[PDB]
Amino acid sequence: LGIRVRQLQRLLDFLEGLRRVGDDAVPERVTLREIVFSYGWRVRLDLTKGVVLEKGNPHLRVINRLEDLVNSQKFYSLATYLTLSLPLFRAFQQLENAWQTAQENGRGSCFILHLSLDKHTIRFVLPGHQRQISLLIQPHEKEGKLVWEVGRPRHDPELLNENCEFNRVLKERVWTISGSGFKGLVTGAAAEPDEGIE
Amino acid sequence: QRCAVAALNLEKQIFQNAQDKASYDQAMAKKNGPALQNQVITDAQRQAQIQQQIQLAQAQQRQQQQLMLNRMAAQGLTQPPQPAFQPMQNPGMRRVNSTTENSKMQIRQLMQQRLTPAQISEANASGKDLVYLYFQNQVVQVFRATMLQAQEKAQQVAQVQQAL
Amino acid sequence: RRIAELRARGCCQGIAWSRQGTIASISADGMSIELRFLRTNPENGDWELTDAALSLSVALVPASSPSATSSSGSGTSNTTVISAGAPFVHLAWAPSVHTSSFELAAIDAPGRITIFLFTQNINKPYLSRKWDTDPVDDLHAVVGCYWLPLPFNVSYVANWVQTDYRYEPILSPAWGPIHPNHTKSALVCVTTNGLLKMLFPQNNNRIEETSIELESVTASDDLITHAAIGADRNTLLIALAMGSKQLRVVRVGIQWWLPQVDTTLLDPEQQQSDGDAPIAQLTHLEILPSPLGETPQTVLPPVILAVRSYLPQEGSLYAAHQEPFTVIDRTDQPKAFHPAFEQLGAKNSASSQPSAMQTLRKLDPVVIPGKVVVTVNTLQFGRVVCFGFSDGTLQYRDRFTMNEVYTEQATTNITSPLQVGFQWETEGPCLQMAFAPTNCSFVQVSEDGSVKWVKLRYPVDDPNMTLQGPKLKAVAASLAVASVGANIAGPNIHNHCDDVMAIARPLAKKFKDFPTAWVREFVTMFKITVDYSEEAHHDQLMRNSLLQFCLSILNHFGFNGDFQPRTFSGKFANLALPLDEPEVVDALASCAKWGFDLLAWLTDRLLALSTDQTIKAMLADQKRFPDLARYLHSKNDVSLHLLLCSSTRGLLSAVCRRLQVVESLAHRATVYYVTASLVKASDFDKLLTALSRDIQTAYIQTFSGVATQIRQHASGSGGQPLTIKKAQSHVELDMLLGQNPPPGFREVLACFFGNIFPAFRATVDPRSVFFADWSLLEEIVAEDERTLKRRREGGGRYVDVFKRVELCGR
Amino acid sequence: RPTPSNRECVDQRTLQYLQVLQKQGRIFVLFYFAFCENQIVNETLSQPVCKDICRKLLDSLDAFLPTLESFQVPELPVVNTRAGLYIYLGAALVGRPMIDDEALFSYLHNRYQGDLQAMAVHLILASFDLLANAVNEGAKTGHLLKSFLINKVPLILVQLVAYAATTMYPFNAEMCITEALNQVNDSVRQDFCFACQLHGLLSQAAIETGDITYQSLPPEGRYVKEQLVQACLQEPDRTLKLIGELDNMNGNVGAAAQAIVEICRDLASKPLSLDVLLLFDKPHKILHPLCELLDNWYQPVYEEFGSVLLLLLAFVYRYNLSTADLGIGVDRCQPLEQLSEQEKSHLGGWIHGLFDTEAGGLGDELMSSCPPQDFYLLAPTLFHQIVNALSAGYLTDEMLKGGLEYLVDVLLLPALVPALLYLSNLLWADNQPIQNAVIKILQPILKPTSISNEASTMLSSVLNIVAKPLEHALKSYQRQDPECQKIEPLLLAIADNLAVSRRTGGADHTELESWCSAQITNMNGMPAPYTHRQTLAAQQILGPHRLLGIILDELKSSPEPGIAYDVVTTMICAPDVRNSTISS
């Protein structure tokens, strides 16, 4: 029952992304694929075996190789999400690497949670129940283009003026475009680092 | 043998993970025949909800990191698991707050459907419910943080096969 | 010429086309009346569009019954009038003032008259007289009709003349008289003899029914001598009718009447007066070489030129001229004929004084006129069309020589075309015409169809006819024609249909600059209060009509004049509102929503500009206009200068602050303790929407509007200070330097001290949030945005005007 | 379900039905001849069926003439009904009688025997006796104008000798009713034959049913020409003494006057005996040799001028003629001037010895020697100055009466025609003093002091020229002042018997107000009703193209084609009286 028609429809529905890729298109043929995108990594899809599967290279997105399966197999084959969400995850990784020297000693710690596929949250914790802070990161309206609006959650009791006093040397509630968010992330990490090493 | 236990202990923890990621949702899809199945929707809801607690108890069985935090105190290793390192990620005090939280969606739904002695486009007090999302997405994650807090302590003793 | 040879001179059948109030109606071959108007072409808007009969025409129904009656216009196209075997023959309009139109139709039948009524220019007429009790005989009242004129609130009527073309042209008024009236703001139609009678129906009483006519026999008949053609007008204080009864005799009856005794008014129109001489010279014999193709017959009714003379001393004599003769051949003998005879009536005394008439002289071109004859300016007759499609050999009233045939500017130019460069364009042979209210265009009916209106056009792209410098005073000409008989309620204009956008200057700063120097707009409202800011002609913002596109990007700095009519209409509606409660409160709430949306948008655009790269430096501040027109960002020239938007919104805030208290005043009466009181259902909605303002509260947008308005005075009264009974007005400076911004320009080289972003702004700053009012819905995207075509997905998404909500059209 | 379908123009439609049904008996401006040619030459293209009717009508309409685009769409027969010559004669004898010789003889839709015209006049008498219009004897040509048969006998005898006119009509004179036109009001059968069909040897032994000639012209040994002119209204036969009487108005113009004053005085009266001359002779044989004597030419000289002028103003005003006689500067250019020209330009009492005796209280008029051509340019101005001088107080009533007693048969009476033709525009005007002055001057004119029976008959012959435009103004003033007239009926009940004139072929009040009628959607021997004063009176009110459309719409649907065509054809090709002018 539609034995070859299954692969026929699969390829006929997946070839749509070949027009919108605009990256290095594909070095692979049917029963597999590859849409490799680097500067100067590739993702090994699957089509046979379950139903489908994805496979990656060891850096920068393995934090979501369990949220991508549903988006790939169920919704559509329109994975234009990586090409516009890469810098954010690069910043995530560089921050989680730069906070290394603190976790050795008893200085502090930083966690990242990814409440959904787009709504992300980051949390700083300090040793003696001094503080427990959590900032939400979320995209917003697309008048010209998408904009990330990072800050304290909306209806969380702000607990005014305990350390937001210090955190207001950066306005504490930013808004950034999809090309220069790393500067804001680093400027927000350095302040908390200087406040924790004291 | 400690190698053979820490291996597949990391597996038990990776496997109990993604349960939170699948439970973040509740998928309340409503949109006589139509009646008598809202209770079955709530049935499947409480179904997917429960059986997380027994797994929590099974994890608290072989929770063996309260005994390693002591050695971790002074200059503990404390290496967080960055999935950029293990590309596999694949095969080879209370949480009744969740039920207490779900319990506030039958009553504030009855109070929304008790508007037939009322207008048509004013029963939309569902400009509320922006508190339950916050409360759940906080309760589940404030204890999801424990998995990341303990998976680090897991390999404090298994640095290089505990022997080299 | 088998149709121009099919023209009737047996009656005064009257034109079938007509126009007033921007409508045009025609009688299509004798069974239906078709309507059409002049639209803006909602797609890529070009004014050139005459609708192709997409409206509800009116049809003569031929069926009948032993007892049936004419129907009225229900929800569908049913507007039927019962016929009796005769087609429509005559259509005429009636003057009106902004409230309700009128239009009557006389049938070539025994002389039955119907009257339609339009209420909101929605081309959907109702009935006012049914003509179901009228005789069937030889009345045939087509031989002439006349609506009485309606008065003016002064002694005379004024029309202007722009002269003195130099640094600026000053303009002086000309004026003529208006003799009769009606003793109301309604009107009255008098249709002349049914070949015998008088028969004028209009006695609109205290009730609203057009009462029965009045009749009075004049020049009874007992043989075959019928009044073939008659015409009437209104000379000093009284009417004046004249007939030509089938022979070479023409008679003049002066029908004096002003009994309307004052309740139920009845009006005996007695006092008809014979005595005006019956000069038998309708055509005199010049017998010499008889057997040649001379001696044509009268074709156009003798139109009475009223006594509009008013020569400087006092009034003068009338002139009842016999319109042309127009032989048409059936040697070669070309058409080549229309002598126009002229006869005036003086009063001389050799003994007991009788009146007398004297033929002046004759003149005859080599074409066939008679399609239409219309008098312009009330002084200079003309526009005699010659049917060769060549509209107009317009000839003066005195001495009848050709006029307006020589271009010149350095002195009095009283008409837009033919003097500054404009010219006509010929379409093709025609049969009937009808001129615009401004006499700047006409619509003709050729052999087959009603060809679109034939308009003037400027010879643009000529090497030495460019519009720059002193040659840009081709605008005072196009202005001095926009004021005609009964035009002081400015907002009704059609001559926008002259678009020269290869120059881009007449867009504004000329055609809006001159009406200021014309009627003294006096738009410096930055001194006292926000109370009397409702002018009838300052509201005439035509810069919106030059929007350059529709559903596409709107011309920036051409919607500064679009944001104002909204915050004018929708924000005086509140003060216009114990009315019908459970249905207007929701509309009030829906308007308050849009108001709060506009406040949010303005307080957003103030940010992201409060921290730009603006540098004063005392040598910059000339960049101000270019740097704003580059970003196409009109959020400062509307909130700072122009001296009256800072008052319109300053009053809108005071109205919203009154609106937000009714909810808190009424909910105490409502909830003070069982099913859908149905008015609290809307009071609840109003209170719910009067708290979703972010932190605006409408109490601080007034302090931040009063602070700057008081700060401006410190400079306005310290910069215009220049060193008994010395006038020393010097308010014209405040007028001029505060009037040139409405047409987008720069500030006044001193309003860059009154720019204290530190003081008067960092205090409204902590009554909002950084990232709370920067991410909203802002459905005002209909005016100000160019990135997306998503709004044209299906049947589009339009915004209402009365309720101000969303709308889909599919 | 009574519902009107046509009104005010349904008379043609309700008339043609009656005529088509009677067809089975024994129960300048232009007109249609030039307005159907237009509809043909411009064929109504995109034509379902309406082109057949139009092209066939243009084909059939060429009976008047002869003195392949649409292929005619058919070959439909033609019938010679009884309603062709009926309409032709009824239209020719409705105004100025215009039945001439060749324009009537060269009317051949028949080709062999003209019996269809010996009862088409009996039918006209029968149709105009009932529906009372007996105002006619001008339609009694049954006796006198039957020279048609005596002229048609030899014109056919030149080649065919088998006509036998004696037995031609006696099978026609058996086909008329014996109740109206009896055999022994109407007594016409006993007098048609045996009184006209023996003067010409066309009936002998006519039991079962002085031939004076054209050479009665020695008017020199006698002057019986005032007995011939009296025996015109007598109809035994031989009213052929009219061509033999119009050869005296030529002899006495090639020679001198003064033997013509009595003839003109006796023809000026009795206006009902002026149509009989035009029945027989052309119009250009009287005017042209009578208008060319005034333009080229003592007490009795004034009389000879006035008595001859009294005839032109009767001919011109009874038939409403124009200046179509001298077109080819003359005294006959006076019909243009009926307006007081001016004063002080070049008049200055040029010839005003008159008004020093004509209205003075001094004496007679003997030495005033001015040419008699002062009728023009000095009647209206003189009377206007008299009215002005009487308005203010300058001429007392005694002088006024002693003056007005100078204008009776003194060769000044025929001068009053232009005088009180212009004086009728000053009574239509509006000012009380002048109106009352005219009323006071009109009293010794209408009702006289009963003097000089000759002058009385001259006045009674003048009055019927101006009686039409003079009572209109009187009625107008009566309407203007309908409270105290007390003078006006005294004059209206006097200038009333002489309101018999204007034979111009036009409708009137009690017929115009009587044939505007309706049409809903739900017979003793006499003929069907018809009157040609209806067609050329609807053609003036309604457009000619509109009436052509009506006729075509009616003919397209009317049953019995071949009979419904003859009526319309002979109704369109009939002689129009209004739009036809005479010539040489």
PDB file of N, CA, C and O in Angstrom, chain A residues 47-78:
ATOM      1  N   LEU A  47      15.995   8.833   6.912  1.00  0.00           N
ATOM      2  CA  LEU A  47      14.700   8.621   6.282  1.00  0.00           C
ATOM      3  C   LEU A  47      14.208   7.185   6.372  1.00  0.00           C
ATOM      4  O   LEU A  47      13.010   6.957   6.182  1.00  0.00           O
ATOM      5  N   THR A  48      15.069   6.218   6.681  1.00  0.00           N
ATOM      6  CA  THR A  48      14.672   4.830   6.858  1.00  0.00           C
ATOM      7  C   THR A  48      15.163   4.333   8.210  1.00  0.00           C
ATOM      8  O   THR A  48      15.905   5.017   8.920  1.00  0.00           O
ATOM      9  N   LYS A  49      14.740   3.123   8.560  1.00  0.00           N
ATOM     10  CA  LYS A  49      15.122   2.516   9.829  1.00  0.00           C
ATOM     11  C   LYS A  49      15.025   0.996   9.754  1.00  0.00           C
ATOM     12  O   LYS A  49      15.281   0.400   8.708  1.00  0.00           O
ATOM     13  N   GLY A  50      10.818   2.622  13.901  1.00  0.00           N
ATOM     14  CA  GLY A  50      10.533   4.045  14.045  1.00  0.00           C
ATOM     15  C   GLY A  50      10.195   4.674  12.696  1.00  0.00           C
ATOM     16  O   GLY A  50       9.838   3.971  11.750  1.00  0.00           O
ATOM     17  N   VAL A  51      10.309   5.999  12.610  1.00  0.00           N
ATOM     18  CA  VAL A  51       9.939   6.719  11.397  1.00  0.00           C
ATOM     19  C   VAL A  51      11.115   7.535  10.874  1.00  0.00           C
ATOM     20  O   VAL A  51      11.582   7.316   9.751  1.00  0.00           O
ATOM     21  N   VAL A  52      11.607   8.477  11.680  1.00  0.00           N
ATOM     22  CA  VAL A  52      12.626   9.429  11.253  1.00  0.00           C
ATOM     23  C   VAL A  52      13.618   9.623  12.395  1.00  0.00           C
ATOM     24  O   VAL A  52      13.387   9.197  13.528  1.00  0.00           O
ATOM     25  N   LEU A  53      14.735  10.277  12.081  1.00  0.00           N
ATOM     26  CA  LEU A  53      15.786  10.523  13.058  1.00  0.00           C
ATOM     27  C   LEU A  53      16.695  11.627  12.536  1.00  0.00           C
ATOM     28  O   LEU A  53      16.809  11.846  11.327  1.00  0.00           O
ATOM     29  N   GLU A  54      17.332  12.328  13.472  1.00  0.00           N
ATOM     30  CA  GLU A  54      18.294  13.376  13.164  1.00  0.00           C
ATOM     31  C   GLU A  54      19.613  13.057  13.855  1.00  0.00           C
ATOM     32  O   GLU A  54      19.637  12.376  14.884  1.00  0.00           O
ATOM     33  N   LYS A  55      20.714  13.554  13.289  1.00  0.00           N
ATOM     34  CA  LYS A  55      22.036  13.295  13.836  1.00  0.00           C
ATOM     35  C   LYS A  55      22.926  14.510  13.624  1.00  0.00           C
ATOM     36  O   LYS A  55      22.904  15.123  12.554  1.00  0.00           O
ATOM     37  N   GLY A  56      23.720  14.849  14.646  1.00  0.00           N
ATOM     38  CA  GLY A  56      24.543  16.034  14.607  1.00  0.00           C
ATOM     39  C   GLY A  56      25.986  15.742  14.977  1.00  0.00           C
ATOM     40  O   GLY A  56      26.336  14.639  15.404  1.00  0.00           O
ATOM     41  N   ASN A  57      26.823  16.766  14.794  1.00  0.00           N
ATOM     42  CA  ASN A  57      28.245  16.976  15.044  1.00  0.00           C
ATOM     43  C   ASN A  57      28.452  17.615  16.414  1.00  0.00           C
ATOM     44  O   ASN A  57      27.681  18.494  16.811  1.00  0.00           O
ATOM     45  N   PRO A  58      29.487  17.208  17.142  1.00  0.00           N
ATOM     46  CA  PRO A  58      29.546  17.527  18.572  1.00  0.00           C
ATOM     47  C   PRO A  58      29.870  18.976  18.905  1.00  0.00           C
ATOM     48  O   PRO A  58      30.930  19.234  19.484  1.00  0.00           O
ATOM     49  N   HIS A  59      28.985  19.917  18.566  1.00  0.00           N
ATOM     50  CA  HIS A  59      29.014  21.228  19.210  1.00  0.00           C
ATOM     51  C   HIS A  59      27.792  22.052  18.825  1.00  0.00           C
ATOM     52  O   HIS A  59      27.206  21.874  17.754  1.00  0.00           O
ATOM     53  N   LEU A  60      27.411  22.932  19.750  1.00  0.00           N
ATOM     54  CA  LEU A  60      26.626  24.155  19.626  1.00  0.00           C
ATOM     55  C   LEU A  60      25.120  23.936  19.475  1.00  0.00           C
ATOM     56  O   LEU A  60      24.368  24.897  19.617  1.00  0.00           O
ATOM     57  N   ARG A  61      24.643  22.731  19.228  1.00  0.00           N
ATOM     58  CA  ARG A  61      23.196  22.552  19.211  1.00  0.00           C
ATOM     59  C   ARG A  61      22.728  21.236  19.813  1.00  0.00           C
ATOM     60  O   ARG A  61      21.524  20.975  19.796  1.00  0.00           O
ATOM     61  N   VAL A  62      23.618  20.409  20.363  1.00  0.00           N
ATOM     62  CA  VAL A  62      23.193  19.147  20.953  1.00  0.00           C
ATOM     63  C   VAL A  62      22.300  19.357  22.167  1.00  0.00           C
ATOM     64  O   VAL A  62      21.720  18.394  22.679  1.00  0.00           O
ATOM     65  N   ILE A  63      22.149  20.603  22.626  1.00  0.00           N
ATOM     66  CA  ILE A  63      21.222  20.903  23.711  1.00  0.00           C
ATOM     67  C   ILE A  63      19.770  20.790  23.275  1.00  0.00           C
ATOM     68  O   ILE A  63      18.872  20.832  24.122  1.00  0.00           O
ATOM     69  N   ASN A  64      19.512  20.634  21.976  1.00  0.00           N
ATOM     70  CA  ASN A  64      18.141  20.562  21.487  1.00  0.00           C
ATOM     71  C   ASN A  64      17.954  19.467  20.444  1.00  0.00           C
ATOM     72  O   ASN A  64      17.059  19.564  19.597  1.00  0.00           O
ATOM     73  N   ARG A  65      18.768  18.418  20.486  1.00  0.00           N
ATOM     74  CA  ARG A  65      18.555  17.292  19.589  1.00  0.00           C
ATOM     75  C   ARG A  65      17.419  16.394  20.044  1.00  0.00           C
ATOM     76  O   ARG A  65      17.271  15.293  19.510  1.00  0.00           O
ATOM     77  N   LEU A  66      16.624  16.827  21.022  1.00  0.00           N
ATOM     78  CA  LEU A  66      15.388  16.145  21.361  1.00  0.00           C
ATOM     79  C   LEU A  66      14.160  17.016  21.153  1.00  0.00           C
ATOM     80  O   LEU A  66      13.041  16.497  21.201  1.00  0.00           O
ATOM     81  N   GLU A  67      14.335  18.317  20.934  1.00  0.00           N
ATOM     82  CA  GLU A  67      13.241  19.196  20.550  1.00  0.00           C
ATOM     83  C   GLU A  67      13.118  19.349  19.042  1.00  0.00           C
ATOM     84  O   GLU A  67      12.080  19.817  18.566  1.00  0.00           O
ATOM     85  N   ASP A  68      14.151  18.969  18.285  1.00  0.00           N
ATOM     86  CA  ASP A  68      14.131  19.118  16.834  1.00  0.00           C
ATOM     87  C   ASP A  68      13.375  17.996  16.138  1.00  0.00           C
ATOM     88  O   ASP A  68      12.871  18.198  15.030  1.00  0.00           O
ATOM     89  N   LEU A  69      13.314  16.810  16.747  1.00  0.00           N
ATOM     90  CA  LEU A  69      12.672  15.674  16.093  1.00  0.00           C
ATOM     91  C   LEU A  69      11.220  15.981  15.757  1.00  0.00           C
ATOM     92  O   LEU A  69      10.762  15.733  14.633  1.00  0.00           O
ATOM     93  N   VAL A  70      10.479  16.523  16.724  1.00  0.00           N
ATOM     94  CA  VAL A  70       9.061  16.799  16.516  1.00  0.00           C
ATOM     95  C   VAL A  70       8.878  17.873  15.453  1.00  0.00           C
ATOM     96  O   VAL A  70       8.036  17.744  14.557  1.00  0.00           O
ATOM     97  N   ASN A  71       9.667  18.947  15.534  1.00  0.00           N
ATOM     98  CA  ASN A  71       9.558  20.019  14.549  1.00  0.00           C
ATOM     99  C   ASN A  71       9.868  19.512  13.149  1.00  0.00           C
ATOM    100  O   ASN A  71       9.252  19.953  12.172  1.00  0.00           O
ATOM    101  N   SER A  72      10.814  18.580  13.030  1.00  0.00           N
ATOM    102  CA  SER A  72      11.205  18.098  11.711  1.00  0.00           C
ATOM    103  C   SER A  72      10.159  17.150  11.137  1.00  0.00           C
ATOM    104  O   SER A  72       9.776  17.269   9.967  1.00  0.00           O
ATOM    105  N   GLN A  73       9.679  16.202  11.945  1.00  0.00           N
ATOM    106  CA  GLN A  73       8.817  15.165  11.394  1.00  0.00           C
ATOM    107  C   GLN A  73       7.353  15.585  11.322  1.00  0.00           C
ATOM    108  O   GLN A  73       6.645  15.165  10.403  1.00  0.00           O
ATOM    109  N   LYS A  74       6.877  16.407  12.258  1.00  0.00           N
ATOM    110  CA  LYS A  74       5.442  16.644  12.375  1.00  0.00           C
ATOM    111  C   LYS A  74       4.988  17.900  11.636  1.00  0.00           C
ATOM    112  O   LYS A  74       4.150  17.825  10.732  1.00  0.00           O
ATOM    113  N   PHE A  75       5.523  19.059  12.017  1.00  0.00           N
ATOM    114  CA  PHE A  75       5.022  20.330  11.510  1.00  0.00           C
ATOM    115  C   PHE A  75       5.201  20.438  10.003  1.00  0.00           C
ATOM    116  O   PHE A  75       4.217  20.406   9.256  1.00  0.00           O
ATOM    117  N   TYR A  76       6.447  20.513   9.552  1.00  0.00           N
ATOM    118  CA  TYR A  76       6.778  20.638   8.138  1.00  0.00           C
ATOM    119  C   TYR A  76       8.249  20.276   7.966  1.00  0.00           C
ATOM    120  O   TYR A  76       8.889  19.760   8.888  1.00  0.00           O
ATOM    121  N   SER A  77       8.785  20.545   6.778  1.00  0.00           N
ATOM    122  CA  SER A  77      10.200  20.362   6.493  1.00  0.00           C
ATOM    123  C   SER A  77      10.911  21.700   6.323  1.00  0.00           C
ATOM    124  O   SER A  77      11.894  21.800   5.585  1.00  0.00           O
ATOM    125  N   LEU A  78      10.420  22.737   6.999  1.00  0.00           N
ATOM    126  CA  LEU A  78      10.943  24.093   6.841  1.00  0.00           C
ATOM    127  C   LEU A  78      11.835  24.416   8.036  1.00  0.00           C
ATOM    128  O   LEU A  78      11.425  25.053   9.007  1.00  0.00           O
TER     129      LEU A  78
END
